[PDB]
Amino acid sequence: GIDAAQIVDEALEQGITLFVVNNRLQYETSRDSIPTELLNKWKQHKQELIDFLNQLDSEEQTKGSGSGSGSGSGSLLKEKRKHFQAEQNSSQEYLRGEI
Numbered sequence: 001g002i003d004a005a006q007i008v009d010e011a012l013e014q015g016i017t018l019f020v021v022n023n024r025l026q027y028e029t030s031r032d033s034i035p036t037e038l039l040n041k042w043k044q045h046k047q048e049l050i051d052f053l054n055q056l057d058s059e060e061q062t063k064g065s066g067s068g069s070g071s072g073s074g075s076l077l078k079e080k081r082k083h084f085q086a087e088q089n090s091s092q093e094y095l096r097g098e099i
Contacts, residue, residue, distance in 0.1 A: 001045075001048065002041070002045055004049045004051070004056070005052070005056075007038070007045060007048070007049055008049070011027065014029075014038060015029055015031050016028070016029040016031075017029060018042070018049075019065035020050055020053035020054050020056075020064075020065065021068070022069060023050065023054065024050065024098055025042070025098065025099035026096065026097070026098045026099070027096060027098075027099065028068075029095065030091070030095065034097070042099040046099045
């Protein structure tokens with residue numbers, strides 16, 4: 001089939017950072033976008049990564065991915081408030097997704 005470690009290896013060489021977080025696969029990178037080459041396979045083998053990587057996170061019982069996803073519940077009011085008062089562009093080209 002395919003090894004999760006191999007799919008992740010390809011991500012890092014492409015400059016994309018994906019791993020299992022909260023039982024889901026997610027990617028992050030600000031370069032050009034995501035090359036369909038790996039992306040096409042990622043969605044197609046999403047479960048393969050979540051299944052193997054889930055195990056990998058448990059083998060270490062530490063480290064691995066963890067940050068982000070802090071807030072989730074929300075509405076446009078979040079945007080409307082920063083529209084009223086804010087500063088900086090704060091990472092204006094970061095494209096992310098969930099495999």
